[PDB]
C-alpha cells in the first residue's frame, strides 16, 4: 500500500529503514555493469523514442554502460517525421552510419524495449499509434506515470500481450548525464529513481527495470506504481522543486527590496542564500544542521517565517495535489500541448520566457562578478519560508499515502542534489525549461499561486505582529523525516554535480556561452 | 435556443449582422407576473449568500407591485446564522416566509437554488427527491449541468428546469432596483434558459423571474453556454484579469519612478472610474479617439504587446472551464474548507491587506466627491487589450453578441467596476460568488506573470507596433454591436460608497 516490495534473480536487494518503515532498495554502481546482460535477456535493440531532456541522458549512459558491460544489445534513437533532432543525435553518437538513428515508428517495429521519452502530452494523443507498431511479447518503458492517469481518464487501458514499466529519474535530464559523466572517475554517480511493474507477460520485467534504471547510474533504486508516481511527481514539481520555489524567490525579492535592500543584496539574501548554502547543509547534513547553524537570534527570525508560511504554503500545496490526483491537471496539460499549434481559427501559444524580468536581470549583474566557490548567505528569514513550504510538502504526501523513499526524493533530495545547482548557476530558466514540458507548463501555472498566497497571508501575518505558533517549530524539530533523509544520505556518492552558467550538456536551446 | 412567449413580446436586434431575440424588461410589464406564474403559489428561495438576498427582495417588491398572492419563502439550513439576516429583510417564521430548507424545497412550486456551486454539486440528490412532480427547478448558474455531465447524469425526468442569469454580482441585482423604481424601473441585464419543460410553463416562468428581478433586457442561452462563458468570464476580464493587470501595473509604475499614490491612481482609479464609464456609455473606440496624439501611440504600445499573452491565459482557463477540469477544481475545493483526512481546514482567505490595497485605503481617504480618476494612456491600453482578447476567444469558440458582450463588457463597467472604485478589491471580488472568488484568486496571478514576463519585456525591448492589430481594434465591428446594446441600458448609474448595507454581511462596514 505504501511501500512495496519485489524479487530480483540478477541484483541484490537491500531493506533501509525509514521512521521505522522497512523499504527495499536496490544500490547502484559501476561494477554491476557486467550483470546488465543477464538483466536484459531478450533484449536486442532498445529504442529510446524523442530527444528531448530524458531522452539525450538516458540514451547516452545506457549506452556507456552496455559498452562498459560488453553488451550487443543496440540503443537505436527514433525521431518523428518533422523533428529537428537528428542532428543533435548525431552529436551524441547515434546516426544512421551504425543504425542507431532513424523514424520512430519504424524504430518501435524493431525494439524489444521501447523507451517513450517524448512529451506526455504527445504520449496522450499518440498512444494508440505506438501500441499498434509494440511487437508481441515486447516491453514498454516510460518515466513518467502520466499516460497511466490519461488512459483511466478515458476508461481505457494497456494492451493485454505486452509488459508495461518504469523507471523514473528524480531529477533532471541534464543532471543524470553530468552526474554519470562525474562518476566514471569513481565507482558511478547519478540520480535516484524509482521503478514500477504495471504488466509483465514473460516473468523479465523487473530485472530489465532494476537492468534500466542500474545503467542510468542510480545510486540507489526504490519500487512505486504508475499511480503513485504520477500523484506524487506532477505535484512534486508544481510544489518545491519548480513552483514553489520560484513563487517565493519572486515574493522575497520584492519583499525585501520595497524594505529597502539592495537588489543586489536581496538576490544574494534569496535565490544565492537557497541554491547556495540551504542546499549544501540539506544535501549532506540535513534540515536540523542547517537551524542549528543560525544564531540565536536568527533562530527567532527564522521562527517567526516557518509559522507564518507553514500553513498558507500547505493550502497551495493541497490544492494542487487534489487537483492531480482527481484527472483535472492531467487533462490540462493534455488540452496545452495542442494549443503549441494554430487550431480553432486561433494563433499557436508556445510557452516563453520566464527570466527576463526584473529580478532575473539583477541575477545576471550579480552573477557576472560573482568569485568561484561562493556558498551565499544564510539569511534566517528566507531560510523559516524555504524550509516551512519543504516541512509543508513532505506532510501532504505523507497524508495522502506515499512512502517515505519517494517522499524524501520528490521533496529534497531532487531539489537540493538535482535541480537547485542549475539555478545557482545561471538562474531560474536554466532550472525549469531543462526540465518536461509537463513540469515547465506546471511551474508556469503554480509559482504565481505561492507568491500570492505567501504576500496575502504570510508576510501580512509577519507585518501585523501574529503570534509564532510554537507547536509548528516543535514539530518541525521532532519531525521523524529528518532521521529518515540521514539514513537516505548515507547512500549518495561522494560526487556533488558541477555545473555552470556555459554548460554544453543542457538543451541545445539553453546553450550560452 | 428559439423561443416563444405567450405572455411576453420578443423583439429583434441586430448585433454585427446576427438577428438575435431578447425580452426587454420595466416595471410596467409587472401586472403580466400572475400569468407568467402560472401554477405557482409559492417561490422556494435557497440560500442567502450573495444572489438570494437581492432576488427575494426583487421578486417580493415586484409581485406586491403585481398585487401577486404568490408566497416568497426563504430556506435555509439546520442553524444557520443566516436565519437573522432574512429576518431583517422582512422574512419570518411568524408569516410563513422563512424557513427550514428541505421543507421549503417540498412545498414550492418554482425553486431557486442559490445556494454555493459546490454545495450543488455535492447535495443535488437530496434538492432532487424533494421536488413536487412537475415542479420547477431555477439555477441562476448552469454549473450543476457541467457537474452531472462529469458524472454522465442529468436531472429528474418529472421536472422542469430553467435559468435565470444576472450577469452582475447580487448586491447590484439589488441596488439598481430599488434606484429604478421611481423611473420604470433599473437592473442587471440577464440570460435565460429552459433544459427541460415538462408542460410549457416554463418559458414564461423564466421570462417573468427575469423581469421581476429588473433586468433591463433578457437574452436567450442554454445552461453549457452559460456555464462555459461565466466561469471563464470572472476568470477574466471581470475579476481575475483586472486584478491581475492592476497589481502587475502598480509594480511597474512604482519600479519606475511613480509615487505608490499615483501608481494607484493610474491604475485602479482609472481603470474603475473614467475608463468604465466612457466605455459605459460610449464604448471603446470613444475612449481611444478621446486621447491626444501621444495617448494614442502609448495606447498602441500596451494594446500591441499586450494582447497576445493576455489571449494565451484566457484560451487555456475557457478550455480548463469547456473540459470539466476547472467545474471539478471548484468541487474539491469546497471540500477543503472543512477538516478531513487528518488535515486542516482552509476556508479563502483575504486578497486586500498587501502594499497596493493599503495605499488605496489612503488614496480613498482624501478623495473628492465625484471623482473619476486619472485618464492614463498605457494602462488603458492594456485594458483593452485584455477585453478585446476575452471577445475575441468568445467569439472563436462560439458565443452569440448579446452573451459575448454581456459577459466582456457590460458586467465590468456597469456592475463590478463601481465596488472597487467604491473600496478596494475585495469589495468587489469578494461580494461574488464562491465558484468565482475561488476563480479571481486561481487566475489573477495568472496575468500579472505573463504580462510581466511577456508584454512589459516587449515594451522594454522596443517591439514594434503590430499595425494589423491596432487596424483590426479600430474596424472591429464588435464596436457597433456594444453600441446597440448599451441603447438598452436605463440611465440609471449604481450608487455604491464604502459604507453600503446591502453587500454581503461580513463585508459591511462602518
Ligand atoms: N525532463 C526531465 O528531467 C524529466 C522528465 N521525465 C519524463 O520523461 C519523459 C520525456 O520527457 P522530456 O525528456 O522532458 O521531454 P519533453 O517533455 O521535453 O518532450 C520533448 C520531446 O518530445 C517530442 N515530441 C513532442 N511531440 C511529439 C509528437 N507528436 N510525436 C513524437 N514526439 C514528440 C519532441 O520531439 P522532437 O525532438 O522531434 O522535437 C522531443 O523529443 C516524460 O514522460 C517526462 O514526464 C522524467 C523525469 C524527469
Ligand atoms: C523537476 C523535474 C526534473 N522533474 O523531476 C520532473 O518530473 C519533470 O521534468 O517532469
Ligand atoms: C463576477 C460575478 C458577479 N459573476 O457574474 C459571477 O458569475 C459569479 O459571482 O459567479
Ligand atoms: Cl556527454
Ligand atoms: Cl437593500
Ligand atoms: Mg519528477
Ligand atoms: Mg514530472
Ligand atoms: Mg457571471
Ligand atoms: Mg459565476
Redo the contacts between chains.
Keep these: 500500500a505504501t511501500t512495496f516490495d519485489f524479487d530480483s534473480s540478477v541484483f541484490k536487494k537491500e531493506k533501509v529503514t525509514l521512521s521505522g518503515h522497512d523499504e527495499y532498495i536496490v544500490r547502484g554502481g559501476r561494477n554491476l555493469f557486467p550483470l546488465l546482460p543477464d538483466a536484459f535477456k531478450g533484449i536486442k535493440q532498445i529504442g529510446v523514442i524523442g530527444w528531448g531532456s530524458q531522452a539525450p541522458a538516458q540514451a547516452q549512459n545506457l549506452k556507456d554502460s552496455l559498452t562498459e558491460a560488453k553488451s550487443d544489445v543496440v540503443v537505436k534513437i527514433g525521431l518523428r517525421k518533422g523533428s529537428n533532432s537528428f542532428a543533435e543525435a548525431r552529436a551524441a553518437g547515434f546516426s544512421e552510419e551504425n543504425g542507431t538513428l532513424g523514424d520512430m515508428w519504424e524504430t518501435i517495429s524493431g525494439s524489444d524495449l521501447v523507451l517513450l521519452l517524448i512529451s506526455d502530452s504527445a504520449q496522450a494523443d499518440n498512444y494508440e499509434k505506438v501500441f499498434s507498431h509494440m511487437k508481441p511479447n515486447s516491453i514498454l518503458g516510460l518515466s513518467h506515470g502520466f499516460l497511466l492517469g490519461h488512459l483511466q481518464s478515458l476508461g481505457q487501458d494497456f494492451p493485454k500481450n505486452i509488459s508495461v514499466i518504469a523507471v523514473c529519474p528524480k531529477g533532471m535530464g541534464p543532471s543524470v548525464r553530468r552526474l554519470y559523466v562525474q562518476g566514471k572517475e569513481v565507482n558511478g554517480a547519478g540520480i535516484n529513481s524509482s521503478f514500477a511493474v504495471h504488466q509483465d507477460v514473460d516473468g523479465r520485467a523487473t530485472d530489465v527495470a532494476l537492468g534500466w534504471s542500474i545503467a542510468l547510474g542510480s545510486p540507489f533504486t526504490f519500487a512505486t506504481t504508475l499511480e503513485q508516481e504520477y500523484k506524487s511527481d506532477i505535484f512534486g514539481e508544481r510544489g518545491i522543486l519548480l513552483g514553489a520555489v520560484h513563487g517565493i524567490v519572486e515574493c522575497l525579492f ?1 519583499r525585501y527590496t ?1 524594505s529597502g535592500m539592495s537588489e543586489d543584496l536581496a538576490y544574494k539574501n534569496t535565490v544565492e542564500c537557497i541554491t547556495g548554502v540551504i542546499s549544501k547543509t540539506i544535501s549532506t547534513k540535513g534540515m536540523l544542521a542547517l537551524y542549528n547553524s543560525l544564531s540565536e537570534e536568527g533562530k527567532k527570525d527564522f521562527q517567526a517565517a516557518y509559522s507564518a508560511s507553514y ?2 504554503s ?2 497551495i500545496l ?2 494542487c495535489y ?2 492531480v490526483a ?4 492531467i ?2 496539460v493534455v ?2 500541448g495542442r ?1 503549441f499549434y494554430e487550431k ?4 499557436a ?1 508556445p510557452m ?3 527570466d ?3 529580478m532575473w536581470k539583477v541575477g545576471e549583474k550579480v552573477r557576472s562578478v560573482r568569485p568561484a566557490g561562493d556558498l551565499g548567505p544564510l539569511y534566517p528569514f528566507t531560510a523559516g519560508v524555504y524550509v516551512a513550504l519543504m516541512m509543508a510538502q513532505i506532510e ?1 504526501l505523507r ?2 499515502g506515499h512512502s517515505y523513499s519517494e517522499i524524501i526524493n520528490e521533496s529534497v533530495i531532487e531539489a537540493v542534489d538535482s535541480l537547485n545547482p542549475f539555478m545557482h548557476a545561471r538562474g531560474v530558466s536554466f532550472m525549469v525549461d531543462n526540465c518536461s514540458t509537463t513540469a515547465r507548463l506546471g511551474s ?2 503554480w ?3 505561492f ?3 505567501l ?3 504570510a ?2 501575518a509577519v507585518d501585523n505582529g501574529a503570534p509564532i505558533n510554537q507547536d509548528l517549530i516543535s514539530n518541525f524539530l521532532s519531525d521523524p523525516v529528518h532521521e529518515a533523509i540521514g539514513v537516505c544520505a548515507q547512500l549518495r556518492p561522494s560526487v556533488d554535480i558541477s555545473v555552470t552558467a556555459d554548460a554544453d550538456f543542457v538543451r541545445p536551446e539553453l546553450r550560452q556561452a
Excluded at 344 to 347: H, I, V
Design positions: 520584492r520595497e500553513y498558507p500547505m493550502d493541497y490544492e487534489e487537483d482527481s484527472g483535472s491537471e487533462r490540462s488540452l496545452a494549443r480553432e481559427g486561433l494563433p501559444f516563453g520566457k520566464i527576463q524580468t526584473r501532504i497524508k495522502k508556469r501555472k509559482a504565481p499561486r507568491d500570492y498566497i504576500s496575502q497571508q508576510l501580512v
